[PDB]
Amino acid sequence: WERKEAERIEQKLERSEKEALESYKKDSVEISKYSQTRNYFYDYQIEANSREKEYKELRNAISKNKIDKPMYVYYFESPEKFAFNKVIRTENQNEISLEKFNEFKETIQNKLFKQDGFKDISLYEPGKGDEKPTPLLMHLKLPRNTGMLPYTNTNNVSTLIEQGYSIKIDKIVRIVIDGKHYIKAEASVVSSLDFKDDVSKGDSWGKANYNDWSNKLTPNELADVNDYMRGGYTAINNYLISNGPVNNPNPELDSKITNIENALKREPIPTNLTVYRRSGPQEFGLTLTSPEYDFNKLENIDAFKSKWEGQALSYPNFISTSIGSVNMSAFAKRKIVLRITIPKGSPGAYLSAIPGYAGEYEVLLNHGSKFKINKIDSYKDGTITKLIVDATLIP
Amino acid sequence: SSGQIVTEGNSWSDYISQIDSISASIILDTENESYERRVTAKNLQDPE
Amino acid sequence: IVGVGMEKLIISTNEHASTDQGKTVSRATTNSKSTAVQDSNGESWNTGLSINKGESAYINANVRYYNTGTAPMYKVTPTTNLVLDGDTLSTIKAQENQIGNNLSPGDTYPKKGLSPLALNTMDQFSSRLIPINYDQLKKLDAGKQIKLETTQVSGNFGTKNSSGQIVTEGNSWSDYISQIDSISASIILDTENESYERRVTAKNLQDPE
Amino acid sequence: IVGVGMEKLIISTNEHASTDQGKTVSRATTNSKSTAVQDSNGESWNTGLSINKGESAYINANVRYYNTGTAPMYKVTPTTNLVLDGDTLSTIKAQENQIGNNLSPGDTYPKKGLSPLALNTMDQFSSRLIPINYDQLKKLDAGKQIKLETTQVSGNFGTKNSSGQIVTEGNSWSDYISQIDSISASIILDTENESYERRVTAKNLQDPEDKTPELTIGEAIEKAFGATKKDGLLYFNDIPIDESCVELIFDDNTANKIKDSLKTLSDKKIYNVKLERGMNILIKTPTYFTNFDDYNNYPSTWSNVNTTNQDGLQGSANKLNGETKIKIPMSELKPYKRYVFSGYSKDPLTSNSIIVKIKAKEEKTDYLVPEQGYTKFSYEFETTEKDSSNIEITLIGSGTTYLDNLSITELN
Ligand SMILES: [Ca+2]
């Protein structure tokens, strides 16, 4: 019956997705890698990539079919995807010690990890005749109305999905499969709003959510915020970095800070949202001339992840970020991109709501905001390897 | 999943015993038509 | 290790018997140039016996299966020979009526305490009986006995899934019989009330690998 | 390599026989204007016999399967012909009742010690017997025999699936039979109580892109039969299978190829000829053979025993001015078979021929003139009764001739 359902669902596909699926059956790894890191380029390459049409039609085919109930999936995942740089056990070893289990449990206590690519999954437990490439097994509960495309292989049937969410691990236990120890993790999907390339859709959402926000502001504070974001945001942030109220207190800027904070506090974000901000080395306590800014050698990336991944963050100033993820000529030289998930109910406002050029879809957050970094990944950008940071805003 | 209706492989015999085991049967006879129903009933000996 | 033993054989002679009986009444009148009136009545009896020399009788054999190995066989389907004097009358593969679902080591199908099963059809759909000749029927009536030989047995094994799901369909024992027999030695222990047959892997000293 | 051999045939005449028996009682009364009373009694008997000319009888054939190849066959399903005189009565593909699950190389189905299986149905579901006509039944009753010929065999091989399990369904040998036959030469070793048939890949010299390795006939034989080498000669298990110790039978094409290749060869040995596609080589080990060095098989003993000279094909000649006498007790030969006696001879200096005398059924005398080198003669005889007089072989001759590798081989 599963084969018949797969045949039925694949019959109604049109041709373009037909050769897309056929090409996926032989070049899975490269297509998956491209789909993982595709939205961090300029507007030119994304339209100019040789695989953009492939990805578009594959995504459409996947999104054609959706499930009406939550259901479970099973797949093997590398522990490196969950910010674990060590090895649980070798591929020839049979057992995992208590120390490695404890370390892996400690690494994933309270964190959320984002998955952003294609993946082959199974609707049944991995019994005999399957492959066990990693010592980590995932029991993932997919939410309602998510894409799921069953396609018949040469002999068996396999299913492909598109990851667009962030998952958290509840419990991990050690199990035995055919005389080898594995780690089984029960994970749940946490929903969030992400506009990877639909910058138009994100802008429309910002309009629909914050166009009337300005009408809720008292005119004096409204004009205050407008003029400040227009001209003096640089000065305010520069004053805030130096801990101005601590060193040289002055009310001419404390009033500005309070007004901006109250304006942001007036209307909070209603739904979980992801924002992309191109950060600089000066933010991370580095300089452009610093040797660690060269992310081409593996040693620099490894040291940066060792000393920064999994730690916290704190910005005394305000944070300006864009809903879209595509690179711009304004921040072309910045090698670090900050990926931030905004929990529902947190303070923040859409600056671009007001008419005119209010910014690059800018979003403001309250001062003294703190973040937790979960994982760090690197993607190629022309002739240099740039770096991506996943962070979660915390109250 | 496409909005279609399929009946092949969907047998009532797989559910007859399960429905009969956990239900009560009620029949209304009237004059021109008879009606038979099963309504789920709670097991008081099972706390779950 | 599955074998078949025959417990008794039953013969069904294929003969047609008829029986008739009639009554007749007559009456005649003659005029000459004298007169005469004649009254007659009679009766008759008849018997008959027809026989076909090609299919003169049908045979039915009662058999059991037994297992002296180490593993169970599922869906036991043996093939047997029926030999009268030096001629193989027929070879029959068991049909759906004569298939044993389970046969554990040391067990019997049908189980101990039940009657033997009847093997009395030869076609695939169990709609055709097993015939013999007129000469074979005469030999049987002369005291000669029919012997049953088992030539091969078909069966299945179970592969256990990680969640304890047994599957037997598509797991044929015949795919391993030759391979096991090629690399093993056979040892039989007879005792008195039960027999045990085993295969133990032996090393080939001509192969360095 | 699977064949089918019939062991006996059983005929079931399809006739209907009936018998009747009756009795009657009557009574009459007449009044003529006189009176009369008549009492009657009666009996009757009858016999009948009906025959259908279209289907007069049914036939049952007891058959066996055997394998002489290198690989097992699973689900053996042969197809056979039944020929009476020049007419094929029917061709039957084996049904479920006549399928052999396993057939290992050198084995037999049914296994040795069991009775043959009965092939007595022709339809797909084993529900219809095999009929013959009235004329065919008359021919059968006249003493004519039915022969069985196997035309093809269907079977499966085993592989490994995505797991470690062996799978045989869907793996047909017919997908590979033609391809194997197209690119290989066939070699058969007859031996005494077991036959072996092999296929060895041969290189095509017309194709520059055929990179398969080249082999001579001797190397091919050694690889195919797993023969070992003792002193440059091949031994199967203990029988010598060197070209000088056996009988080699070819077809016309193979004989022509070997003859053409020999003249251009240096050693001029058959085992040095290059192996080619389509060759058919049959090797037949002799029943009795002696090389006068280490191998002796004859029941009797040759009169002349003088093997102290380094002559012959391999270090022994056993020939002087004396004569050799041997007598076969006729209790060690097949009753009705066409044997052949063979050997090698040489006259290093020209002399008289050798009087070859054979007396098995009809006494024969023949003369052979040895050349400067070694040549073989191979005259024929035939046994009679398995209990008749002995067979005497004598080679009276003069002129200090020479001999080696005397052998007696059966032929069919
Ligand atoms: Ca010699």
Q: Does A326 lie in the same domain as A219?
A: yes
A149 & A277 share domain: no
Contact A340, A365 (CB under 8 A): no
Q: Do chains A and C touch (3 or more CB pairs under 8 A)?
A: yes
Pairwise CA distance, residues D25 & C191, whole Å: 74
Helix, strand or coil, per DSSP, at residue D146: coil
Identity at A346, one-letter amino acid code: S
D244: Cβ–Cβ under 8 A, 6 or more apart, which residues? D313, D314, D344, D405
Q: Is D293 flagged in the annotation as binding?
A: yes
Q: Taking each helix axis from N to C terminus, what angle separates A28-36 and A52-64, rounded to the nearest 10 degrees?
A: 90
| Largest pairwise CA distance in chain D | 131
Is the distance from CB of A183 to CB of A104 less than 8 angstroms?
yes
Closest chain A residue by Cα to residue C161: A127
For chain C, the residues before each gap (C–N > 2.5 Å) are 33
Alpha-carbon span D117 to D119, nearest angstrom: 7
Both A303 and A393 in one domain: the answer is yes
Question: Cβ separation of B2 and A12 shorter than 8 Å?
Answer: yes
C116-144: burial string, b at 16+ Cβ within 10 Å, e else? bbebbbbbbeeebbbbbbbbbbebbeeee
Residue in chain A lying closest to D164 (CA): A129
**Contact indicator for D242, D234 with CB cutoff of 8 Å:** yes
Residue A197: count of CB within 10 angstroms of its CB: 17
For residues A233 and A177, membership in a common domain is answered with: no
Q: Which residue has the tokens 């007004």?
A: A259
Ligand 1 center from residue D290 Cα (angstroms): 8
User: Which domain covers residue A204, as residue numbers?
Assistant: 194-395
B31: DSSP letter: S
CB–CB contact A177 C163 (8 Å) = no
Q: Is any Cβ of chain D less than 8 angstroms from the Cβ of A131?
A: no
User: B-chain residues within 8 Å CB-CB of A147?
Assistant: none
Specify the number of domains making up chain A.
2
CB D287 within 8 A of CB D408: yes
How many Å lie between the alpha carbon of A154 and the closest alpha carbon of chain D?
A: 12
Tokens representing C110 are 């049908």
Compute how many other C-beta atoms are within 10 angstroms of the C-beta atom of residue D241: 21
CA distances from C47 to A358, D21, D22, D23, D45 (A): 120, 5, 6, 10, 10
The encoded tokens of residue A66 equal 């959706």
> What is the rounded distance in angstroms from the CA atom of residue B43 to the CA atom of residue A51?
59
Q: Could you say which of A132, A160, A193 is where a domain stops? A: A193
CA distance D22 to D13: 29
Q: What is the Cα gyration radius of chain B? A: 16
- For residue A177, the chain C residues in CB contact (below 8 A) are 162
Last residue of a domain, one of A193, A224, A249: A193
Q: Which two tokens stand for residue D327?
A: 């007598």
Chains A and B touch (3+ CB pairs under 8 A): yes
In the numeric block, the tokens 């003529």 are attached to D32
**A1 vs B1, B2, B9: nearest CB:** B9
**One-letter amino acid for residue D103 of the chain:** L
Q: What is the resolution of this structure in A?
A: 2.6
Name which of D169, D145, D152, D146 is nearest D94 in CA terms: D152
Query: Within the 37-76 window of chain C, which residues sit less than 8 Å (CB to CB) from chain D?
Result: 37-54
Asked if the C-beta of A123 comes within 8 angstroms of chain B's C-beta atoms, the answer is: no
User: Strand, helix or coil at C138?
Assistant: helix
Question: What residues are paired with A122 via a beta bridge?
Answer: A74
Q: What is the DSSP letter of C86?
A: S
* Cα–Cα distance for residue pair D362/C154, rounded to 1 Å: 57
Q: Are strands D88-93 and A362-365 parallel, antiparallel or unpaired?
A: unpaired
Chain D residues with CB-CB distance to C96 below 8 A: none
Q: Please count the residue pairs, one from chain A and one from chain D, whose beta carbons lie less than 8 angstroms apart.
A: 6
Mutate to test the interface with B, among A3, A7, A8 (most CBs of B within 10 A): A8
Domain match, A144 and A231 both: no
Q: Which of C196, C193, C172, C162 is nearest to C77 (CA)?
A: C172
Please report which helix (H) or strand (E) contains residue C132, including its range.
Answer: strand C131-132
Same domain, A155 and A262: no
How much distance in Å is there from the Cα of D347 to the middle of ligand 1?
16
How far, in Å, CA of D124 to CA of C123, rounded? 10
Q: Within this chain, do residues A243 and A377 fall inside the same structural domain, yes or no?
A: yes
The answer to whether residues A326 and A350 belong to one domain is yes
Closest CB to C174: pick one of D101, D110, D125: D101
Q: Is the CB of A12 inside 8 Å of chain B's CB atoms?
A: yes
Per-residue buried b or exposed e for C21-38, using 16+ beta carbons within 10 Å of the residue's own CB: eeeeeeeeeeeeeeeeeb
B and D make contact (3+ CB pairs below 8 Å): no
For residues A8 and A71, membership in a common domain is answered with yes
Domain boundary among A147, A176, A193: A193
State how beta strands D280-284 and D338-346 pair: unpaired
Q: Name the burial class of residue C76, with classes exposed (0-12), middle (13-18) and buried (19+) by CB atoms within 10 angstroms of its CB.
A: buried
CB-based contact (8 Å) between A265 and chain B? Answer: no
Q: Is C164 on the interface with D (CB under 8 A)?
A: no
| Among the listed residues B4, D101, D58, the one whose alpha carbon sits nearest the alpha carbon of residue A11 | B4
Q: Note whether A183 and A283 are same-domain residues.
A: no
A131 and A216 assigned to the same domain: no
Chain breaks in chain D following residues, C–N > 2.5 Å = 33
Extended beta strands in D174-233, E state: 184-189, 196-201, 228-229
Instruction: Compute how many other C-beta atoms are within 10 angstroms of the C-beta atom of residue A25.
Output: 11
Structural tokens at position D252: 């016309």
The secondary structure of chain A, three-state, reads: CHHHHHHHHHHCCCHHHHHHHHHHCCCHHHHHHHHHCCCCCCHHHHHHCCCHHHHHHHHHHHHHCECCCCEEEEEECCHHHHCCCCCCCCCCCCCCCHHHHHHHHHHCCCCCEEECCEEEEECCCCCCCCCCCCCEEEEEEECCCCECEEEECCCCEEEEEECCEEEEEEEEEEEEECCEEEEEEEEEEECCECCCCCHHHHHHHHHHHHCCCHHHCCHHHHHHHHHHHHHHHHHHHHHHHCCHHHHCCCHHHHHHHHHHHHHHHHCCCCCCEEEEEEECCCCCCCCCCCHHHCCCCHHHHHHHHHHHCCCEEEECCCEEEECCCCCCHHHCCCCEEEEEEECCCCCCEEHHHCCCCCCCCEEEECCCEEEEEEEEEEEEECCEEEEEEEEEEEC
Closest C-alpha among C104, C105, C66, C109 to residue C198? C105
Q: Which residues are CB-contacts of A170 (< 8 A; sequence separation ≥ 6)?
A: A186, A187, A188
Which residues, 6+ apart, have CB-to-CB distance to D356 below 8 Å?
D365, D366, D367, D368, D377, D379, D395
Pair (A225, A177) in one structural domain: no
Q: Does A130 touch chain C (CB under 8 A)?
A: no
Residues 155-184 of D with CB under 8 A from A: 161-163
- Pairwise CA distance, residues D335 & D388, whole Å: 9
